């Protein structure tokens, strides 16, 4: 029933709605907003020249409903409730420009997230519209990308160009602490992955691909939070010379240590080895995996981090060469 459901605390209803990933719905969106809106992607839209706020799936953003600002703001407390946006074949340029000018004129520009679900061409007016328009769009830190062609033709900065309105202003590249990306086959196969211009980043998200190597990946400072979701086999760092460094003088149970202060040869070697090991993973402190089903590259890790929940694998357990320091 309804009020009997609503006479209850928040955690029970949270787990219920988690399983179910309308007053039902109003409490649903209260608590989903309260904790985390990983479930429902929620952004602005216009139909008939009339603005509304539509609420979507996350993967490809099929709509469910939309509702009015004043309805939603009587439902809740009005504010600069920070929010999202995503451009499609539905949402390109004039609706994008209309929302821009109306958020300037009638309203203010409260929205953060931007999404590139469609428009892999870098073309047909969406990029053309939006690249001038980011200046009055200032709460953000957060972005979604789809295609490797777009990533190669926009993001991977080896392909430097001189197309100023075609690409971002770089003051925005400062103000993008988070990132999201999906939807390609072979990122790192002989690739040019290098992102030092992408500065003041602090969190990355990846999902849904078929291949990766991490030796190809070179990165800025300040970014350590890595989220990675269900993919195919991975080429981890090789560490084969560093495997060759090792002796079985010390090896126990998947861990190693020198207790002997006197053995400055092996003690110094141990610390050299540990510091090489973190130097491989130097700008990184946190990894999340959903089931990716294979990793190839002779894993040897630190024990500080796996004793905590930093190295957070699901059971993509097709690997044996695991070890700790």
């Amino acid at each position: 029933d309804t009020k009997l459901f609503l006479s209850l605390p928040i955690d029970i209803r949270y787990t219920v709605y988690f399983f179910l990933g309308d007053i039902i719905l109003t409490d649903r969106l209260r608590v989903c907003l309260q904790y985390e809106e990983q479930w429902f992607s929620v952004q602005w839209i216009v139909v008939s020249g009339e603005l509304e706020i539509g609420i979507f799936t996350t993967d490809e953003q099929f709509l469910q409903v939309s509702y009015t600002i004043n309805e939603y703001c009587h439902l809740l407390s009005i504010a600069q409730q920070d929010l999202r946006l995503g451009i499609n074949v539905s949402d390109i340029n004039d609706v994008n420009e209309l929302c821009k000018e109306i958020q300037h004129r009638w309203l203010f520009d409260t929205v953060s997230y931007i999404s590139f679900i469609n428009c892999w061409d870098l073309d047909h007016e969406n990029v053309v519209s939006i690249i001038p328009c980011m200046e009055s769009f200032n709460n953000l830190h957060m972005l979604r990308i789809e295609s490797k062609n777009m990533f190669n033709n926009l993001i991977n900065t080896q392909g430097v160009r001189e197309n100023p309105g075609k690409t971002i202003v770089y003051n925005v590249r400062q103000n993008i602490f988070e990132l999201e990306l999906y939807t390609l086959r072979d990122l790192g196969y002989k690739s040019v992955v290098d992102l030092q211009k992408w500065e003041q980043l602090q969190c990355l998200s990846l999902s849904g691909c078929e291949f990766i190597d991490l030796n190809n990946l070179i990165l800025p400072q300040h970014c350590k939070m890595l989220i990675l979701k269900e993919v195919k086999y991975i080429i981890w760092w090789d560490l084969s010379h560093l495997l060759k460094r090792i002796r079985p003088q010390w090896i126990i149970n998947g861990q190693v240590k020198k207790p002997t202060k006197k053995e400055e040869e092996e003690e110094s070697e141990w610390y050299n080895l540990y510091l090489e090991v973190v130097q491989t993973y130097q700008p990184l402190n946190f990894i999340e995996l959903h089931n990716a089903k294979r990793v190839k590259g002779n894993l040897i890790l630190p024990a500080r981090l796996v004793t905590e929940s930093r190295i957070k694998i699901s059971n993509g357990t097709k690997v044996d060469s695991v070890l700790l320091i």
């Binding site: 029933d1 988690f18 179910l20 059971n315």
Partner: protein, 126 residues
């Protein structure tokens, strides 16, 4: 080994130790009688009924949310939970009180099944 548990009405029910050490609150509270405030007799009786049906069974983790939502609703549990809403909510409440998660998750699963398998006449009542 066995331990006593007081239904707050006053009923000093008894369970085997380790079959209750399945629980987490109890496993910490010990680490023989224990109170159980705001819990009734048949409530705890059916709780222990599930607890004893599900002793040797595997339960994945409190983090594997995909396998969690990988949802085999157990038929024994499913028929066992063919009860009213209020007793059911009380079961769920005491499950939250005890940190015994799979029973709790199954209760939420079936309430989700109720409010999924719905009619618009449920809404036209509203």
């Amino acid at each position: 080994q066995n331990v006593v548990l007081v239904s707050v009405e006053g009923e000093r029910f008894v369970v085997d130790r380790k079959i209750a050490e399945r629980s987490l609150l109890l496993k910490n509270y010990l680490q023989i009688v224990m109170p159980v405030p705001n819990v009734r007799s048949s409530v705890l009786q059916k709780v222990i009924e599930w607890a004893v049906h599900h002793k040797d069974s595997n339960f994945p983790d409190e983090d594997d949310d995909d396998s969690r939502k990988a949802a085999p609703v157990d038929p024994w549990d499913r028929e066992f939970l063919k009860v009213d809403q209020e007793m059911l909510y009380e079961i769920i409440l005491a499950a939250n009180y005890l940190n015994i998660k799979p029973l709790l998750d199954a209760g939420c699963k079936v309430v989700a099944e109720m409010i999924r398998g719905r009619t618009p006449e449920e809404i036209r009542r509203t």
